[PDB]
Each structure stands twice: as C-alpha cells, then as structure tokens.
Symmetry: D2
Subunit: 385 residues, 4 copies
C-alpha cells in the first residue's frame, strides 16, 4: 500500500503545517517551511501540494518578500517535480473578514476580498493550478438580523460572476470549486452542503466554470451521507476536486486523517470515486492532532494515503468478486439502470401491468437481499473473505 505520484495524492501546506492552535489551545508545533513540506511529501509519494495565498506568502508581505517566498517554493517544486493542482484564498483568518469576504456587510471589504482572490488566481495559474477553491468560511451569521441571505446570495453571485469574467478575460483554463461547510467558524455558513452549492452554481452567469470541492468532514457535520453527496455531484458533472479526511459525526470540524472517523463511509467513497473514474486530485485537507510531534505529522500524512490505497484494494476486490456480482443481481442493482418508461408516457398510461394488473403483494413479498450484499461488503473491507 505504498503511494506513488501517479495516485495523485495532494496535501495543503496548511495540513502538515498546522501548528496545533485550537479554540482552547496554543500551538504545539513550530511553523513548517513550505520548502520542507514539498520535499517531505515528495519522499512519502505525494503527487502535489496546494496553498492559500497566506500559507505561501505571509499576509502583508512586500512585493520583494512575496517574490522571494514564491521563488524558494518553485525551486522545491522544480527540484522534486511536485505539482500544484489547486490553490485558494484565505478569506477567513484576518479580522477584516470577521463578517465574511464576498458577503461581508461592508462593501469595501467585499471589494478587497475580490482583489485579494484575483491576485492569487494569477499566482495559481503561474503554478499550474487547474482548480481554484473557494471556501466561504466567514459567509453567514450567528444571529437572524445580521445577514439578509437573499442579499448575501446576490453579493455571492456577483463575486463569483466577476471571478468568471476575470478568468475568461485572461483566457485562463482554471476552473472554480466551491467548498460547502454547514457551520464553524460562523454559527451557520451560506451554501452549507454540496446540494446548496450545486443549486447556487446553476444561477451563475457561466455555470460551466464552477463545480464543488466537497469535504468528507463537512457533509458529515450535517449528518449527511458523503458518498451520496459525491454521487449527486458526479451526476451533475460538478466534482472538480475533493477534500479527503475523517470526522466522527456531528461536532466541530475534526479534520482527522483520511480513513479515520467513518471508516465504512470512506470505503463507499473510494468505491464510488474509482468506479466513476474520478480523475481529479485525491486531496487531503486534514490536521495531524496537536498531540503529535513532526514524526507524528508525517505518519498521519502517510496514513491518509495508505488508507486510501487499502480501501481502493478492498473496493476493487468487492466489485471483482463474482459472488458480489451475483448479490448485486439478487438485489436488482442492475434493474435500477434500466429506464423506467423508455416506452413513453402514453405507453405507461395504457399499460395495465403498471397499475390495473400490477400484483402489489407479489412485488412487496420480494426480499431486497440488501443484508447479504452488505455483509459481503463488510467481509471485503475487513479481508474476511
């Protein structure tokens, strides 16, 4: 279960570089040099890294400081052949963004947010990012009066439309991926799920330019089925990127290493991604627990990729197993793929077998055989076949 760069595993600078500050705790680790992160992740078999602007270039950097940070980073990338498939803006950390970036009540803040984003889009393109992620962590409210959500959605559309106009004007190929999260740090965050983000995108001027960057933990913070959400994103053609981590149901965003939290959900996710032929980065947005030293950081990072590869093997064996294939037939997964009424409305209306002469009781009596199928899945996950 050794990762190779062809596996397209990527990590945010901010993941292995998390110093372990939480709402009740000071840092437990010194800052990481992005250069060290690039080299160490390469050694572990990573494909690439990602960054917020402010991960790579300290906020408030001079142009000359900015140049030096980027130069050193590119030297590390060039030396190792590591890629930068995705980049994003920090519109959450600085107190200016305390009521949001794109949907800050203060108009001057909204304009600044856009300029900050646009600057980093340029850098992303220079570094070869195919996807530009937007997580609106500060977009929302703790109280009802604070935020008119219709107005906020107007501002959010305006922002994303302007970003679309910008990339088009520049002839960039980069696409946008909106990252939903239901809450935290805001009491409620706008576009709280994959669903809300997908719906919003349809109302943008150039919807083709926007998809989703769903995160395992985020959907699970709403107690939602992450594989189901990813399925709908795939169905919409909108899975531009994905964030992989672990979460123990409905609490604060834990950002455990992938495979931790809901193990079975991780299995069904990997099954879906591989079955669907998702070709995007397998990106880990995770935090090595602050209990850990740097040995633990790199162990946790390695664990992300290991767990993906184990689950990939087990999902593949599941699908390849003739006993499972028969179980799928027994459960009529194959019938689910048949059109309901390719014969058309009139044919359906005129079909006595579909109502008048439908034996509801015979149909009802048919077991779905789902439990046998699921225990085959369990056996395969646990290598108990």
């Amino acid at each position: 279960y050794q990762p190779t760069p062809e596996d397209r595993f990527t990590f945010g600078l901010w993941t292995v570089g998390w110093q372990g500050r939480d709402p009740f705790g000071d840092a437990t680790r010194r800052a990481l040099d992005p250069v060290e992160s690039v080299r160490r992740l390469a050694e572990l078999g990573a494909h690439g890294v990602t960054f917020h602007d402010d991960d790579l270039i300290p906020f408030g950097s001079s142009d000359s400081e900015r140049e030096e940070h980027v130069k050193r980073f590119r030297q590390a990338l060039d030396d190792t052949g590591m890629k930068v498939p995705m980049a994003t803006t920090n519109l959450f950390t600085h107190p200016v963004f305390k009521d949001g970036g794109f949907t800050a009540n203060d108009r001057d803040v909204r304009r600044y947010a856009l300029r900050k984003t646009i600057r980093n889009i340029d850098l992303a393109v220079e570094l070869g990012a195919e996807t530009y992620v937007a997580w609106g962590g500060r977009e929302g409210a703790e109280s009802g009066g604070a935020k008119d959500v219709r107005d906020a959605l107007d501002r959010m559309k305006e922002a994303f439309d302007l970003l679309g106009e910008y990339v088009t004007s520049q002839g960039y190929d980069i696409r946008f991926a909106i990252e939903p999260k239901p809450n935290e740090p805001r009491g409620d965050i706008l576009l709280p799920t994959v669903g809300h983000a997908l719906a919003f995108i349809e109302r943008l001027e150039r919807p083709e330019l926007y998809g989703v960057n769903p995160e395992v933990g985020h959907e699970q913070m709403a107690g939602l089925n992450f594989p189901h959400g990813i399925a709908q994103a795939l169905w919409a053609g909108k899975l531009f990127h994905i964030d992989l981590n672990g979460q123990n149901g409905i609490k604060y965003d834990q950002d455990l290493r992938f495979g931790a939290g809901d193990l079975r959900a991780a299995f069904w996710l990997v099954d879906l991604l591989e079955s669907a032929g998702y070709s995007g980065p397998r990106h880990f947005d995770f935090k090595p627990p602050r209990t850990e030293d740097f040995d633990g950081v790199w162990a946790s990072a390695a664990g992300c990729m290991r767990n993906y590869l184990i689950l990939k093997e087990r999902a593949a064996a599941f699908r390849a197993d003739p006993e499972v294939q028969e179980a799928l037939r027994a459960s009529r997964l194959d019938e689910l793929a048949r059109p309901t009424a390719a014969d058309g409305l009139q044919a359906l209306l005129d079909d006595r077998s579909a109502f008048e002469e439908f034996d509801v009781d015979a149909a009802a009596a048919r077991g779905m055989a789902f439990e046998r199928l699921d225990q085959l899945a369990m056996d395969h996950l646990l290598g108990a076949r």
Copy 2:
C-alpha cells in the same frame, strides 16, 4: 391572534388525523373521518386541507368505495368553503415501496409508483390543488451497496420528467414541489436538503414546473438553518409551498406543532416569509403528540396558527421599530443590499482603494453591532420593548 381564512393556514388530513402509532407504540386515538377533520379545522379558522391519496381513499378501494369517500369529502369542502391547495401521493406506507417508489430497484414498482401518482394528480386538480408535493421518503438506503445513487437520480429525473409531460399534456396549471428530508424512514434519503432538491430540479427537462416544499423539522434534522434554506429557495424563485412544524435539533422527525422546537428559528422564518411576501399556503405538517385526546388534537392545531400569528405580529413590530431600523444601519444591512462592483471588473481592478490603499486595520476595527441588533430582536419576540 384569531386565525381567519385569509391567513391561508392549511393542514394535512394525516396531521390532526394521526392515530399516534410510532415505532414503539400502538394507536392512542381512533381514526378521524376526513369529513369531521374538515369541519373542525374550518371552525378553528383554517383556510384549507391537504391529503395523500391513501388518506382520502383507503388503499385498494373499489371504484364505488373511492367515489363514496371522494363524494363525502367534497360535500364537507362545499359545506365549509374549505379549499384543497395541495395534495400528494403516499409512496412510503405500503410494503411494495420498501425500497422506494420512483427509485425502487424493481422497475415494475417504479412504473406502479408513477401510475399511482398520476391517478391522484387528476383528483388533486379536480379539487383545486395548485401544488402537487412529492416526498420520496423511501428513496435511499441503509447500506452502501443497495443503491447506485447516480442510477437512482437518473430514474428520479425520468419520473419527474414524465409527471411534467403528463401535466403539460392535460393542460393542468398544477406545479410540483419536491420535499427534502435527510433521513427517516430510510437510513439516508435521496435529495436530503433544500439544496440537493434545488440542484436536482435544474436538471429536469421543464424546471419551471418544479419547486421545493421545505419542512422546518426536516432541514433541522441535518442541523441546518431553516430560514437560510428558505432564503435560498426564495432567491431561486422555487418556494412553491412550505411545511410548518417544530423540531428539537438532530433526532427523529418530531413533527411538533409550529412554534414548538426552535422558537427563534420560527420567528426568523415568519419574518422572512412576510418580508418576502410569500403568498403560498401556510401548511402545517405536524402530529399532535400521542399523549393527547381529540381535545388535545384541536388545541395543538389551534396552537400552530396562534404561534404563526404571534410571531407575525412580533416580526412586523421588529421591522417597524425606528430603533431597529437604526440598528440595521449600524450593522450595515443596507450596505449588504448594494452591488459590490456595479462599476465593473476593470474599474474594480484599477481601484487602488480596493487593495493597495485599503486600510484593512481600520475596516477590521469596525464592530458589526450584531449583538445590539439581536437583543432588539429578542426584546420584540418576548414583548419586552
């Protein structure tokens, strides 16, 4: 706080009619005659009633039995002047639907589900329904292998497309409203939130024919902000109908009377509906707790309407209060309503005041004054102003 018909309060037959069977409990109340329900609801100042097919006509009724049930119901409606603004299909109760209606793995069940729906659409239109609701309560899974969600969404789209074709073919004015729910009775339900439903609708052949019927409790079962969800639905022009009730956060679907559960959320919902000039039914999908006799049923129903009317008064008083108008200005709600960059992309890019010359620290230092605003809101809700 006396309800009158022009308040547009409506109830499902299945609400006041709930006999109090739960997963651990037998009925605590005898079945209600729909005729009595109509009469009692009329006396309480209800505008209308709604029904599943199987609430009005017992499943498997003969034509003569069906005619007699509909005859008696129509007489009650005519006697009282009660309206039927909405109806729906029961695609969840009968064992045949144990793996779904429209997305049953069994093709013959999918076809039956459609025929059952179409039959009731005709009756709904006869009785004057402007909205036809679909709650796909059995669409989903308890286990990962049981349901291919991409295939399921293909079948779901086919079903809704066919229903659209049908209403078009008949020259009906009735529109569909998809009712999301995250879980229960399936382990996970497809289209689990307002977001997922809105997204799905955009992929239908005739999206204009479909909106959402969000339920307070359902969004809150995912820990989501219901007012925020309703805001997004309104933003999308897709709030065709709404289900009002109470829920205490993330647990089984409680269907408490409206005002119970999250009282603050109820306030902000009514504020939004009234502000936005929602003109649809105020429909209660609730269950009088099984502790109650019939006196308690009618008390609970009266409570739904009473609570709406109190909250309406308090929300209106909030928005009218000069002190609140000043607080909203202090919190820059007015700035939120102004376009971020009506001067356009190029002007934004060239605006040094938006970046190089933006005083981030001065902006960050401005308090949002949200707490003062919210306490004004609290004072108004509690009548302590």
Copy 3:
C-alpha cells in the same frame, strides 16, 4: 468466524421477529413463532434468547393462553439447550403507557406498570434470567410543563426500590439493568445516557442490585463515545449486560446489525470487552431492515455474530502484536496506569520536581505518538499488516 454457543451470543425475540412496521410504513414480514426463532438461532450458533413479556405472551392473554405460550417456548429451549439469560417488560407499546410506566403522571398507571413488571420477573426467574432489563422508553416529555423531572425521578426511585424489595423478599438472585436512551419515542427520555443511569443507581436503597444495559446505538444517538461509556460502566462495576447493534450517528434509532454503523467504534468496543474480561451475554438488539425477507433476517442475525468474531480476532492480534505493544509504551499508556501521587499529598506539595523545577517546555515538546498507534490499529482492523 463461525459462532459457537460458548460465545454467549443472544438475541431478543423482538429482533429477528421485527415485522418491519416503522413510523411511515406497514409490516413487510409475517409474525415469527418464538419456537421457530429459538430453533433457527440455535442452528446459527446462538447461546440464548431474550424477551419482553408481550413478545412471548400476547397482551391480554388468558392464564390458560399464557400457560400454553410458555409451555411451547420451554419445549423449544429444552430441545435445543438454548438459554434465556435476560428478560424485560414492555412498558412502551400499549397506549396506557403513552406518558410512561414508572413515571406516568397517572398514579394508577404507575402501579399497573409495577404489577406488570413483577409478574414477568417471576417468569424470568422460572426461565433462568440472570438480568432483568428496564428500558423506560416512555419516561420523559415532548414539552417542559408536562413532566416535573425531580418528581419523576422520585417516582422512578420508588419503582426501582420496590422491585429491589420484591426480588429480595423472594430470595431471587436476578439483578436489574437500566437501559439508557436519550430520545425516541419521547422527545427527551429520562436517564438519557449511561452516565445518568449510573448516577441514579447510586441513590437507590440497594444499589448493588442495579447496573446498566447500555446499547451501542443509544449512546451514539447523543453523539457519545460508546467504548468510553462502557469503560466508565466497567469502572463502576455496573456492566451487567450490553446491547450490540449499529447506528449512523445522530438520528432515529436504526438498530442496524452489529458491525454496521460506526465500524471503528465496534472494534474498540470488542477490544475493551475482551480486554476487561466481560463475562455477560453478547446480546444483539437489532432490526433486520424491512427491505429483507426471512432469508435476509437470518443473514442479518448471522452477520451480528460474524462481525463480533472478526473484530475479536483483529483486536486480539492488535494487542498481541509486539510492534503495537512498543507503540503503547511510546504513547505512555503504561505510565497512565501508575498512581499520580502514591507518595501522598504532603510529598506532592513538597516536590519541587512537580512545580518549581518542572520543565513545562520539555514535557510539552514530547510527541504522544498517537497517530502511529492508531494506524497500527487501522492496519490490524483491516488486516493490512
């Protein structure tokens, strides 16, 4: 992973015998004869069965009907050598119990609840039950005014004290196990967690007679760590019995087969039970999903026991692995077992190494190595060592 009776796997009649009625659904399976359940479970390698009074003897049975039901049951038990280690009362299904048994507001209902319980205690003793379970599913409220909880706890203590007096008076060896659940079917249930039940027991007249019967799904309905709860129960000497099943975090009580839901929690539970040398029944309180026919029922039941046995093997291999043993030392699990201050208060106060001369920074710099340990645990669970 073949179960043997020595494994002490037990099932409620109501588990495999669940006909699949849920709050939105009619039965999907015919009723099971307890006699068939005994014989089929025996064939699958079960140790025993359990029952509510009303599972074995239909409510309202004549004495002669009661005698015939029990006679047939005992013939099946005697034929197979199947045991009845636990029994319980149904104080939830009948509408009389709509506001509770022991803490019904109606005093006459409370007295009836006790008499119903006492009758079944006698039967339990006849059948050789070592544990008598009480799940107060109807003890609680949907509204604040309905239930004075101090009064309710007075009534609950009175009831349990009377039950203690009864078993003592009869010289029975049977002990009581209180089963917590946070909600459902009541909006909130009294003694909602293992903690609340443990605390309550300490205030009973004869606390030695009472322990807990924790259920996986129930604790997880409060988003709690079930293994942690079981640890505290073990610490208190109060794990008389346990209910094993699966649950996907915070929603309605799913009662999935054991191993389903939170797989990693199941692993850590089995690790703890085996490590602690828990000698009580491994009891499954689960429901074969209503999607299933009887083939699926028995497959689901078999899966309960299979999953326990796989997890038992993996937990044992984890603990036996010298690499894991070293990881545990690296993480100072062994230091956790050392008394903090066996040298006593004065010694601690006078110990400069404990404050004045404690190098906080050196201590802080020590990594806990928890991530390496946890990935060893993951490898072992998945058989990827």
Copy 4:
C-alpha cells in the same frame, strides 16, 4: 429588566475578555485589563467575576508580576464591591496539557496539573470563592488506543481525592464543581455529560465535597435536554454552580449569550432554577461574537442578564396564572408528586385494582392535555396572554 447585584449575575474574565481567536481566525479585539472588566461589569449591575489562574496572572509570571496582577485586581474588587464566588484552573491552553492535566498519560504532567490547581485554590479562597470549578477539557482522546479510560478514571479519582484532602487539610469551606463537556477540544472528553460527572463523584472518597457545574451549551452539544439534566443534578443535591449561555444544537461550542440558541430551553431552565430556589451564582460562560467591538461586548453581557430577568418574569407569571394551575391539574402534574405505593409492596401486590381489575383501556383513553398546557407556556413566554 435592570440587573442589580442581588440577582447574583457573574461573568468569567475570559468571557467579555475573549479576544475572538477561533480555529480559523486571529483576534478581532485587544486584550482587556481585568480591572476594566470588573469596573464595566459592575456598571452593568453584575454581582461578581470569576477567573482561571492564567486569566488573572499570565502563565510563567514571577512572584513580583503575580503580586502586581493580584494587587490591581483586588483594588478593582474593593473599589466596586464586586465578588469572586468561583475560580478555576487553566489545564487546557498550555501545550504541556495537550493530552490532559489530571489524566495526561505522562505522570509528571498529572503531578504538575495538581500543583497548578492547588496554587490557585489558595488564591480562590483568599478572594472569597465558595466554588472551585474543574473543566477537564483536555481529558480524552481523538483515537481509541490513546487513552485507557478505566486507567484514566483511576487517575482522575486520585486527583480529585487529593484536592479534597488538600481543602480538608487547610480547613477551607470551598467545594468543587466538575464541568462536563462531551467534546471539543478533544475528539471525546471524559465525563461528557452531567450524568457521567454525577456518577463519577459518587466514587470519590469524600463525595460531599464535589458537585457539578453544568453548562447550557455543553449538554446541548450532545443534543440533551439541559433543564432535565439540571433537574437530575438538583435531585442529587449536586448543583453547586451553573454556566449560562446559548447553543444551537449539535455543533462546535458556540458560547452565545444567554437567551440565544434554544430560547424555550432557557425559559424552562429559569423556571426550574427559580422554582427549586437555586441560590448559587447565575454565571455566564459566553463569548461575545468576534464580529463585535467593545461596545458589542458590553451589549452582549447586558443581554445575558436581561434575558434571564425577562424569562424569570415570564416563568413566574406562568406558574402564578390560575389558568396554568388548572392546566397542570388537568395534566395530573399533582398526581406525579404523590408516592406510587406508600401503602407498601405487599399492599401493592394484593391490590386487584392495580392489575386484575385495572381498566387499562379507560386509563389509556385519558388525554394528558399536554398541548393546552404547553401553549399556555408559549403564550406566557411571548407575552401573549
């Protein structure tokens, strides 16, 4: 609704003093001088303030630095007549506590934690604290192997026993209050609910010295009914102190001002505290949202107290209302207060009216009238009576 000192409203230094650092955000406010906090809180009509050691004296202060901080604080207290009814230790912020204080795997950390606590107990007593709170925020785990919970509870008991020995040895009157929290910042925290804490206390050497300090938000993070929890604490005689704030169900710890979050729960809490004649501090552990400037801080703090006083008025009016007294009788709350079987076990056994001759159907038919009662409660809360 003007607060005055005799209302016993108290605030942590860390509440109004919160600089607004969260897991995704830098400070939005400058540090507050405790002297200013004391003065401002006094002007708002606060009774008292509380502190962690490290709120009052910066970690690692010299004796001269410590004396100067305490000197200035004492002067503020003396100037204003503000009391210090409670204090506590910070065993969570410093990296040394990253795996806990009392249940750190590292023995030397456990000993340090105790010495740090004991130092502050002395200061607490000097300043007139009647209660010493312990929130073990770092006691727990993110992973299953990291913490043996039985061993941890052994260490936790040792720690609390030693603290009991200390206060006894010094002849202090101060009592301990353990503050439960289910999670955050640990993945799971030991003693996660009021229940678990109550249970644990019963196993201490001197249980009379220990109660609970429950927090609204903490119980609600497990989706529990806070009033119910407080009722059980009162029942046990263990409500030594209470933390008041707001929380929106199952998510990160929000620490909204009291009255925000679950408003209904706030009502029923105040009703209970006042009815039970709780005489302890009404302490607010809250954070003014980081959106706010200092004007917003003091508004938020004022809101805490205002909301308590409104709810107090409404609860008193509810209980005083003859209509409510009648509704409570109709719902048999008076019957709940009567012993079930003061006639004793034998009399109960011999009472045919309790079984053979009990009319179950007549009992079942009696409505509980809970909905009428609750709507009276709603009317009173909203001032609509």
